[PDB]
RNA sequence: AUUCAUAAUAACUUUUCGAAUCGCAUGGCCUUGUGCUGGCGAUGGUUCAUUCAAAUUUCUGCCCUAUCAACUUUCGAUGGUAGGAUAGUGGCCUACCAUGGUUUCAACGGGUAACGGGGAAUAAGGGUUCGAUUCCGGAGAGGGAGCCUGAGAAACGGCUACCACAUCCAAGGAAGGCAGCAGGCGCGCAAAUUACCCAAUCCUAAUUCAGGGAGGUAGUGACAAUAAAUAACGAUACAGGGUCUUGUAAUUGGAAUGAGUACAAUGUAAAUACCUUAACGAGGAACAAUUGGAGGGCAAGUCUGGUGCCAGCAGCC
RNA sequence: UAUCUGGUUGAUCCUGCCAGUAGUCAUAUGCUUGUCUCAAAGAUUAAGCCAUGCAUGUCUAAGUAUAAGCAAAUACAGU
């Protein structure tokens, strides 16, 4: 999440299915956390999982335990009571200790989600990469300012968005358009079970990461 | 911190472990506490004790301060003071070095890994080396 | 997988809580003796009811019964040592006629107020609570101490507790520092 | 339940050990030996709870493995060795001896004895049979089997086994008028004289015992340990001599000894 | 109380036992030979006794149901005989022979959200209800069934097969059992740490030494329970009771102290925390207490304003 | 010592029910939750299903040491 902006923050709270909400332990709760929690509560609450960082800055165990209890009870006020949150110790090698990260991975590898009302009728889409498709001669000849044809890639969630061209589309923070064309590219990061199913139709050792938005 | 009074009551002589056992109580009307190394030094100079053969280990300060009651004991001929004392109290007095091991999870995991081989395992090592090398 | 430790309730909420007679009676009790709330009165009433049940069970027993003699002598000696029963009232007919005001009088709050140096039961309560009382030579800060009869004459200020000398407290040091750094120069 | 039990929890230990119910959830559980485990005493309880010569269990083990503690003249290195009645537990580091006898309150008492009289021990002979090759033998209350006894030594009597190799010394017959210790029931620790033996065929004979204050009681036959003639016990009795005063005069004696 | 203990005669046996073991000591004798003899132990071994146990076992005592009155007895049900098997008694099983055994004092069948007891609560007493659960006994290790080893298991952190689930892969095969400690799923509506240690209590072994999620320590939703802070003493002006006793105040004066922070020391296996303490830490004590209710019943409002309607008076107050 | 008051009546009395106040080793839930001591915690519905880690191993002077193991009595002798 871009922390300073509220706009994409609201879009994230509208879209996300699991939200890892992180709080500085030594500082306390901040206004961004409260604003995101209220936006998520009003727009349809997703699965919220709290994590607290900067806990090695505490110099005494008594203050650390009391602050952990206070943060946990404030979280239990904002979220359902008994909700468990994770305590992260240090950043000693640019990353967190292995046990806490293991428990974070284990909790979200067995959890199930709730059917929200808004997600189950309106189709939505998370865009993973971006490409502008215009001819460079069209860019050069008529002054670089004519509005463009843009093809964007991503994953569909919620509802089937019909295969007829011209269905109306809203892009949050941009506006309202009508889509010219759509197609289904093959999935670039398939599950392994999909790969044994494919191999069974004819009868990915390291590419578990698909990040076209960033560089390798 | 004006003065400290050191009184050893209930003294029982134990020739079974070759020591003397007692309940110390200290009147320390001002300072903070007992300062157990300093208290050990003065209890050593009390009898004739050769300080490393003196062990005071139980202590509790009475509510309101000033009075602190604990249990301690003094050996003789410090060789069996090293023989008969527990290891943690020997380390606490500087008479031993704290040994470094792995945690219990790592030790138990190492034991369970070594449980899965029969013999020294050099045969299996050479077999898997020649199998996965070629 | 261990031995259970014993515990008991020390009070009992009345079945008829807000009837006016017991309400203003316990209001008078908590006002004259400076009690914090109504659990003090209920606790003292629970102790009085236990003593009354013991005295009734002993008085139903026959005279010169060794059980009656032993437990009656023990109970009367205990209440004399506490300070409730008078020295000329060592009979079971008189412990069946006891009252909660005898137990409320015996507590440390009143017993430091009645000896002077406190000037009100609430100043006595605050003085005890703020870690000042020295019973014998031991610092007491519990207002329901129930002072023993033999220990009634040893109540004084601590070797700590700056009203008994020994380096006056923090706000006096604050005032001295302010008068030294600002009023001094 | 599928085999023998090796643990004994606190609240299941015998009450006469005086083990506090806090500070641990397990009891010593004395091993197999000469005495029944509910009428015996482990060496750890004697060296720690009674004598207070040790502070932990490993200190008791360090005492025992140093070959200091001897039961009936023999070195024992067992932490939970079941010492019981009439044992001659002795310590040579302190040059100090004990005889395990019951206090009048119903528990084993600390009864220091001299160097002499720590060289013999009374044992209630409990069965007299005939062994292999026609050799008569007796066995007593602590499993001591003695070959070739006196022909007048009958069942349910006492014998004087010294320390070394059995070799029964002078014995006394079970009869009316003898001095008797009570080693069971609610009359535990009381000493008296037999006045009648109410014999019952089928089982469970009864003994009527009158103490030195002429306050009689009755007990079963198997809780009777004859320990000498009237006015002369064959050992040194503990403090109080087994009188069982009621709580009133015990309290009065406590205030009599109270002060200065 | 015995055909008991034990002894004796005759024989018998795929026939047992009666030390071919280990450590630490270097003594004594002379025929002066690595001669003779000899100490303290460790471990095995036959039987008896003992101890830790186990298996059967006598008497009496369990909730509801008659819209359950007859039940067992083919294919053992009651008993006698002989045998097999058992560690041993025994219809435990087998061959034979009798026809028995239980019951209106309730046999038998059925239900039980029925493990039993010590115990818990409500009572003045009798009763009534609860007891999965810190101790004792029993049973089980997803459901039947069988077995090896061993003194002891019909053992499941042992084995074999069947039933139901279910893991791996190269498709040939291998492997499984959290009603142990953590932890997860079982609804999309939720509840302790996949932490530290054998220091204490004890248990195991060849064994002072190793091991122990048994157990202890700390963490975690106010289970339940104990004690207890959030203020105390004044001066001034009004209101009083009226010259000595109180309330009110965007009035004021100094004392006292811990909730927290923290050198130190104690504590502890190492810690956290408690107890102790140099220093910091209070006027809006902002270092900021809550949950309900108000004619009654078993307490505290004959308090205030606003709203919907009226074919009631006036007509927009 | 042992907590009841009304309605069901115009009164007098059974019988059940309702409204109210109070006590709860009773279940569930809400709000609030500074200190000390203490100690309960997947039975209630499912003896339903389980990822991963651990939970049973053990050596004395005294059973077997030629480790081409480690340091320093030509039969071995420490660990």
Curated annotation (Swiss-Prot), chain A:
Residues 88-97 are annotated as: G5. It comes from the Eukaryota. It is found in: Cytoplasm; Nucleus, Nucleolus. Residues 1-3 are annotated as: G3. Residues 53-56 are annotated as: G4. Transmembrane segments: none annotated. Residues 1-114 form the Bms1-type G domain. GTPase required for synthesis of 40S ribosomal subunits and for processing the 35S pre-rRNA at sites A0, A1, and A2. Controls access of pre-ribosomal RNA intermediates to RCL1 during ribosome biogenesis by binding of RCL1 in a GTP-dependent manner and, via its affinity to U3 snoRNA, delivering it to pre-ribosomes. GTP-binding and/or GTP hydrolysis may induce conformational rearrangements within the BMS1-RCL1 complex allowing the interaction of RCL1 with its RNA substrate. Required for RCL1 import into the nucleus. Belongs to the TRAFAC class translation factor GTPase superfamily. Bms1-like GTPase family. BMS1 subfamily. Interacts directly with RCL1 and the U3 snoRNA to form a stable subcomplex. Component of the 90S small subunit processome also known as 90S pre-ribosome that consists of the 35S pre-rRNA, early-associating ribosomal proteins most of which are part of the small ribosomal subunit, the U3 snoRNA and associated proteins. This is Ribosome biogenesis protein BMS1. The gene is BMS1. The chain holds residues 120 to 361 of 1183 of the full protein.
UniProtKB/Swiss-Prot annotation, chain B:
One of its GO terms (biological process) is maturation of SSU-rRNA from tricistronic rRNA transcript (SSU-rRNA, 5.8S rRNA, LSU-rRNA). Gene3D superfamilies: 3.30.70.3370. The modification Phosphoserine is found at residues 13, 55. GO terms for molecular function: structural constituent of ribosome. GO terms for cellular component: cytosol; cytosolic small ribosomal subunit; mitochondrion. Residues 101-134 are annotated as: Disordered. It is found in: Cytoplasm. Pfam families: Ribosomal_S24e. There is a cross-link at residue 20 (Glycyl lysine isopeptide (Lys-Gly) (interchain with G-Cter in ubiquitin)). InterPro entries: eRP_eS24_sf, Ribosomal_eS24, Ribosomal_eS24_CS, Ribosomal_uL23/eL15/eS24_sf. Its main location: cytoplasm. Component of the ribosome, a large ribonucleoprotein complex responsible for the synthesis of proteins in the cell. The small ribosomal subunit (SSU) binds messenger RNAs (mRNAs) and translates the encoded message by selecting cognate aminoacyl-transfer RNA (tRNA) molecules. The large subunit (LSU) contains the ribosomal catalytic site termed the peptidyl transferase center (PTC), which catalyzes the formation of peptide bonds, thereby polymerizing the amino acids delivered by tRNAs into a polypeptide chain. PANTHER family: 40S RIBOSOMAL PROTEIN S24 (PTHR10496). This is Small ribosomal subunit protein eS24A. The lineage of its organism: Eukaryota, Fungi, Dikarya, Ascomycota, Saccharomycotina. The gene is RPS24A.
From Swiss-Prot, chain C:
SMART domains: Ribosomal_S4, S4. It holds the Pfam family S4. It is found in: Cytoplasm; Nucleus, Nucleolus. GO terms for cellular component: 90S preribosome; cytoplasm; cytosol; cytosolic small ribosomal subunit; nucleolus; nucleoplasm; small-subunit processome. GO terms for molecular function: rRNA binding; structural constituent of ribosome. The modification Phosphoserine is found at residue 183. Residues 159-185 are annotated as: Disordered. PROSITE patterns: RIBOSOMAL_S4 (PS00632), S4 (PS50889). Residues 106-180 form the S4 RNA-binding domain. There is a cross-link at residue 179 (Glycyl lysine isopeptide (Lys-Gly) (interchain with G-Cter in ubiquitin)). Its main location: cytoplasm. One of its GO terms (biological process) is maturation of SSU-rRNA from tricistronic rRNA transcript (SSU-rRNA, 5.8S rRNA, LSU-rRNA). Gene3D superfamilies: RNA-binding S4 domain. Keywords: Cytoplasm, Isopeptide bond, Nucleus, Phosphoprotein, Ribonucleoprotein, Ribosomal protein, Ribosome biogenesis, RNA-binding, rRNA processing, rRNA-binding, Ubl conjugation. PANTHER family: 30S 40S RIBOSOMAL PROTEIN, 40S RIBOSOMAL PROTEIN S9. Belongs to the universal ribosomal protein uS4 family. Component of the ribosome, a large ribonucleoprotein complex responsible for the synthesis of proteins in the cell. The small ribosomal subunit (SSU) binds messenger RNAs (mRNAs) and translates the encoded message by selecting cognate aminoacyl-transfer RNA (tRNA) molecules. The large subunit (LSU) contains the ribosomal catalytic site termed the peptidyl transferase center (PTC), which catalyzes the formation of peptide bonds, thereby polymerizing the amino acids delivered by tRNAs into a polypeptide chain. Present with 106000 molecules/cell in log phase SD medium.
Swiss-Prot record, chain D:
Gene3D superfamilies: 2.30.30.30, 2.40.50.740, RNA-binding S4 domain. There is a cross-link at residues 61, 133, 160, 167, 173, 178, 210, 232 (Glycyl lysine isopeptide (Lys-Gly) (interchain with G-Cter in ubiquitin)). GO terms for cellular component: 90S preribosome; cytoplasm; cytosol; cytosolic small ribosomal subunit. GO terms for biological process: cytoplasmic translation; translation. The modification Phosphoserine is found at residues 31, 246. The modification Phosphothreonine is found at residue 114. Its main location: cytoplasm. It is found in: Cytoplasm. PROSITE patterns: RIBOSOMAL_S4E, S4. Residues 41-104 form the S4 RNA-binding domain. One of its GO terms (molecular function) is RNA binding. Keywords: Cytoplasm, Isopeptide bond, Phosphoprotein, Ribonucleoprotein, Ribosomal protein, RNA-binding, rRNA-binding, Ubl conjugation. Signal peptide: none annotated. Pfam families: 40S_S4_C (PF16121), KOW (PF00467), Ribosomal_S4e (PF00900), RS4NT (PF08071), S4 (PF01479). Component of the small ribosomal subunit (SSU). Mature yeast ribosomes consist of a small (40S) and a large (60S) subunit. The 40S small subunit contains 1 molecule of ribosomal RNA (18S rRNA) and 33 different proteins (encoded by 57 genes). The large 60S subunit contains 3 rRNA molecules (25S, 5.8S and 5S rRNA) and 46 different proteins (encoded by 81 genes). Present with 573 molecules/cell in log phase SD medium. PANTHER family: 30S/40S RIBOSOMAL PROTEIN S4, SMALL RIBOSOMAL SUBUNIT PROTEIN ES4. Belongs to the eukaryotic ribosomal protein eS4 family. This is Small ribosomal subunit protein eS4A. The gene is RPS4A.
């Amino acid at each position: 999440c871009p922390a300073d902006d509220l706009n994409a923050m609201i879009d994230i709270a509208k879209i996300a299915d699991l939200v890892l909400l992180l709080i500085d332990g030594n500082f306390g709760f901040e206004m961004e956390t409260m604003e995101f929690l209220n936006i998520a509560q009003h727009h349809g609450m997703p699965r919220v999982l709290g994590v607290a960082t900067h806990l090695d800055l505490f110099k005494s165990q008594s203050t650390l335990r009391a602050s952990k209890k206070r943060l946990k009870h404030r979280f239990w006020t904002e979220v359902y009571q008994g909700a468990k949150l994770f305590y992260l110790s240090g950043v000693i090698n640019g990353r967190y200790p292995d046990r806490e990260i293991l428990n974070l991975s284990r909790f979200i590898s067995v959890m199930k989600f709730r059917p929200l009302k808004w997600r189950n009728e309106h189709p939505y889409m998370l865009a993973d990469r971006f490409t502008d498709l215009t001819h460079p001669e069209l860019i050069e000849t008529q002054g670089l300012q004519i509005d463009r044809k843009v093809a964007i890639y991503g994953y569909l969630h919620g509802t089937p968005l019909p295969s007829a061209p011209g269905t109306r589309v809203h892009i949050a923070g941009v506006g309202d358009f009508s889509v010219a064309q759509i197609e289904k590219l093959p999935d670039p990061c398939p599950t392994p079970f999909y790969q044994q199913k494919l191999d069974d139709f004819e009868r990915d050792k390291d590419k578990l990461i698909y990040a076209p938005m960033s560089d390798v | 911190s004006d003065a400290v009074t050191i009184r050893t009551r209930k003294v029982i002589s134990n020739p079974l472990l070759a020591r003397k056992q007692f309940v110390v109580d200290v009147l320390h009307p001002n300072r903070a506490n007992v300062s157990k190394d300093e208290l050990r030094e003065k209890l050593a100079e009390v009898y004739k004790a050769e300080k490393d053969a003196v062990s005071v280990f139980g202590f509790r300060t009475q509510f309101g301060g000033g009075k602190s009651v604990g249990f301690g004991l003094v050996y003789n001929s410090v060789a069996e003071a090293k023989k008969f004392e527990p290891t943690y109290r020997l380390v606490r007095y500087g008479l031993a070095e704290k040994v470094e091991k792995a945690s219990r999870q790592q030790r138990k995991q190492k034991k369970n890994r070594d449980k899965k081989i029969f013999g020294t395992g050099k045969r299996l090592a050479k077999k898997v080396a020649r199998r996965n090398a070629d | 997988p261990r031995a259970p430790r014993t515990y008991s309730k020390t009070y009992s909420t009345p079945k008829r809580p807000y009837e006016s007679s017991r309400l203003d009676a316990e209001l008078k009790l908590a006002g004259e003796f400076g009690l914090k709330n109504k659990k003090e009165i209920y606790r003292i009433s629970f102790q009085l009811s236990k003593i009354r049940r013991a005295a009734r069970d002993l008085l139903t027993r026959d005279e010169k019964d060794p059980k009656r003699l032993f437990e009656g002598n023990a109970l009367i000696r205990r209440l004399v040592r506490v300070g409730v029963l008078s020295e000329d009232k060592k009979k079971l007919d008189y412990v069946l006629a006891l009252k909660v005001e005898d137990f409320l009088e015996r507590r440390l709050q009143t017993q430091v107020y009645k000896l002077g140096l406190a000037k009100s039961v609430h100043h006595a309560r605050v003085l005890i609570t703020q870690r000042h009382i020295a019973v014998g030579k031991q610092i007491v800060n519990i207002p329901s101490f129930m002072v023993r009869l033999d220990s009634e004459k040893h109540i004084d200020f601590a070797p700590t507790s700056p009203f008994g000398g020994a380096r006056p407290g923090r706000v006096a040091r604050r005032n001295a520092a302010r008068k030294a750094e600002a009023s001094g120069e | 339940a599928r085999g023998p039990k090796k643990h004994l929890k606190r609240l299941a230990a015998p009450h006469h050990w005086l083990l506090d119910k806090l500070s641990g959830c397990y009891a010593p559980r004395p091993s197999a030996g000469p005495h029944k485990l509910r009428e015996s005493l482990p060496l750890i309880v004697f060296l720690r709870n009674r004598l207070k010569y040790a502070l932990n269990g490993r200190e008791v083990k360090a005492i025992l493995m140093q070959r200091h503690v001897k039961v009936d003249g023999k070195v024992r290195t067992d932490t939970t060795y079941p010492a019981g009645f009439m044992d001659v537990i002795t310590l040579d580091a302190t040059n100090e001896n004990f005889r395990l006898v019951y206090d009048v309150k119903g528990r084993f008492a600390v009864h220091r004895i001299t160097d002499e009289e720590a060289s013999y021990k009374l044992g209630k002979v409990k069965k007299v049979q005939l062994g292999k090759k026609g050799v008569p033998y007796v066995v007593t209350h602590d499993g001591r089997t003695i070959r070739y006894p006196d022909p007048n030594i009958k069942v349910n009597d006492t014998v004087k086994i010294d320390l070394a190799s059995g070799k029964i010394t002078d014995f006394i017959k079970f009869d009316a008028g003898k001095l008797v210790y009570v080693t069971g029931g609610r009359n535990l620790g009381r000493i008296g004289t037999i006045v009648h033996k109410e014999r019952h065929d089928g089982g469970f004979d009864l003994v009527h015992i009158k103490d030195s204050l002429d306050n009689t009681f009755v007990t079963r036959l198997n809780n009777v340990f004859v320990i000498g003639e009237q006015g002369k016990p064959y050992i040194s009795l503990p403090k109080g001599k087994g009188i069982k005063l009621s709580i009133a005069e015990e309290r009065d004696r406590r205030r009599a000894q109270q002060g200065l």
